[model samples]
Target: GLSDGEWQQVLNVWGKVEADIAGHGQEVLIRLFTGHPETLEKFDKFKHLKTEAEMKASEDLKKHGTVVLTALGGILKKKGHHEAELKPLAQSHATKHKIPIKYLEFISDAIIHVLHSKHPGDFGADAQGAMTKALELFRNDIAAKYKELGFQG
Candidate 1:
């Protein structure tokens, strides 16, 4: 687990990326696992530990986070001019996961504020270039973290 400050940095990066991707169309996918492949194969083990609500909440968080990241990727690809790549991902993830679209939108807006605070020039093309790169780096970091946490890709 990250320390408080480290976790805050992670959130800060993710928040910025989320803001950069709003309204773009994309799809976010998540996969969950109980253990690393080696450990699971050796032990033939899995843990059915979470309650229904807990499991649901975890899935919701993962879906929301993934959609935010996917949106950021799309925005980066477009050089931050348009948000045509985020809508599909948000809509599909919300529908498939049974998460509320309103909640996702609200959180996405909040994330944009965080990005604006960190990068006041996000609206400018030159400024947006750097911001887009930063968002991509953050997404890669998240992917690495997921792998570390035993996510099976």
Candidate 2:
């Protein structure tokens, strides 16, 4: 569970990211794809993109990236209540979308990478620890849903 101070630490940095959510979001996806091209292949909307230039220029990818970041924003706003809120999404990704848990880890890392890169001075040890716990719970909740649904890798 996140303490109030921890939530504030996360929210403070998130507020900075929110100022340019679209660009930050696209960068997250771009970083993810660059680090794990296999994850790109999982996206039906972006699987056909063969080149880095094509990926950078993709409107469809941008749309999805914004949507993903918006979801993260929602989670951050919800704070501690996010575990319950994530159930349906976890169910869909697990049982229907068939996205593996590892990709969740990848995306979470991508988000942290983006945040850290963009706000180098803002993320002190406290904030880093806070975000780590938050993301851990985020991934754990999804893994829990997958377990409940009996979906295994």
Candidate 3:
């Protein structure tokens, strides 16, 4: 369970990234693609890009990244009973986007990686742990929907 302070920590770090949401989001996306190259094959947005340079520089990629980071930001800002609120998001992503648990884990890892690398001392220790807990629950929420949807895994 997430405490109020934990949620606040998440919001704090998230607010920092929101300053350059696209750039930071793009960084996370780039890390995900670098760590799991096959991940790009899932999204049509990357298929046209000839090189990693194109992927990094593309405005489309940046905008798509903003969409994801902003969604996460919205979830973090929820006042109370947020995990339950995440159910619909999870269900939709699981059923619609086919966002497998593996991808969720990888994305979570990429997000933390970027956060730590970008704001070493500022992000602090608790913020990292708080984000981890939130993201884990978020992934489980989505995974639960997959299980409910006939073992979609």
Candidate 4:
């Protein structure tokens, strides 16, 4: 297991990547590690695999897919372009991790009302801006949840 600092770094990277992809379109591919060797190891070990052998071996085991929420607290601290940051992160994480885009779409829908006005007249340019801030708050909430579940990243 990684130390607390190392784990935070992993969560930061994962959270950032997840947020980017969720907010952005699916185009970017996120690499698990940029420079850290230990992180690379953990990433390699957990890289989503869908091989026939593994699937067959685990056929008897109940399988379920989960949607993880990533916090946007760190991104919110930035001066501007919070959505820009989140979109790419979400896209990259989904593409790199092979997570279904449908799941992220669900998250997007769930938060839309809270982030922006449902009324067309009320939904102005600032609506997207407010949504961006909401995205940051949502990401932060996800980070806390992951920590509680003992997820390293």
Of the candidates shown, which would achieve the greatest TM-score relative to the real structure?
A: 2
Clashing pairs in 2: none
lDDT tens per residue, model 2, 49-117: 888889889888878888888887798788869866698789888877788999999998998898889
Mind giving the per-residue lDDT tens digits that candidate 1 earns over 61-121?
A: 4554465566555554443233345444434433443333333333344444445655676
Pairs clashing in candidate 1? 24-85, 24-86, 24-87, 25-84, 25-85, 25-86, 25-87, 26-89
Local distance difference test scores for all models = 0.40, 0.85, 0.82, 0.38
lDDT of 4: 0.38
Clashing pairs in 3: none
- Model 3: what TM-score? 0.89
- List clash counts for every candidate, in order: 8, 0, 0, 20
Candidates in order, TM-scores: namely 0.28, 0.93, 0.89, 0.25
Error of 1 at 53 (Å): 22
The residue ranges of model 1 lying beyond 4 angstroms of the native Cα positions read: 1-67, 79-88, 120-153
Give model 1's TM-score versus the native structure: 0.28
After superposition, the stretches of candidate 2 with alpha carbons farther than 4 Å from their true spots are: none
**Candidate 3, residues 1-153: lDDT per residue as tens digits?**
689899888888888898899999999999998789878877876877767898888998999999888888777677445666677777776777676789889999999999988988887788889989888877776676778776454
Give the winner by lDDT: 1 or 2: 2
TM-score of candidate 4 relative to the true fold: 0.25
The lDDT, on a scale of 0 to 1, for candidate 3 is 0.82
